[PDB]
Design a protein around this ligand. Structure first.
Ligand SMILES: *[C@H](CS(C)(=O)=O)[C@@H](C)NC(=O)C1(F)CCN(S(=O)(=O)c2ccc(Br)cc2-c2ccccc2Cl)CC1
Length: 142
């Protein structure tokens, strides 16, 4: 069984039944966009890095990663194309986990469809996601 299938079995997304947001919830956002907080502990140093993005609620976990790249990288003054290219090279190496929990964003559903994210919006809290390598997760697998 592929590491993908094992992940998918073990860490199934906890989601709402449909991707449609009720207005009462959509209207808590700024123009449909959610403010989220991406944590990373990377490389050899394992320093606590932290980016705060503002993204459409309906983005897919990987598009969230993409904005994570854009944010970290903005001081490189890269061109659109130099950037998008790199984003295409990198996006797929990593996934999102809820900080401290064992809840993963392993599914191309919209972010606000995930129950964690929807709960945050309701409670008016910022989601705290954690960015990590696919290899990292495949290694942790029972
Ligand atoms: C393209 C690379 S380049 C030098 O122009 O060819 C630019 C747009 N991207 C990056 O520099 C980047 F995508 C490389 C990968 N990460 S990372 O900081 O090296 C990183 C390594 C390991 C983990 Br686990 C997580 C991350 C990471 C940290 C912070 C934000 C996003 C990520 Cl994926 C980011 C930058």
């Amino acid at each position: 069984n592929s590491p993908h299938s094992r992940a998918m079995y073990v860490y199934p997304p906890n989601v709402e039944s449909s991707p449609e947001l009720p207005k009462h919830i959509y209207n808590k956002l700024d123009k449909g966009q959610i403010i989220v907080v991406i944590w990373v502990i990377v490389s050899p140093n394992n320093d606590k890095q932290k980016y705060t993005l503002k993204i459409n609620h309906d983005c897919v976990p990987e598009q969230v990663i993409a904005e994570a790249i854009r944010k970290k990288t903005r001081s490189m003054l890269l061109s659109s194309e130099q950037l998008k290219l790199c984003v295409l090279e990198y996006q797929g190496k990593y996934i999102l986990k809820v900080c401290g929990c064992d809840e993963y964003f392993l599914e191309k559903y919209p972010l606000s469809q995930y129950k964690y994210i929807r709960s945050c919006i309701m409670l008016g809290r910022m989601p705290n996601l954690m960015l990590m390598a696919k290899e990292s997760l495949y290694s942790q697998l029972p």
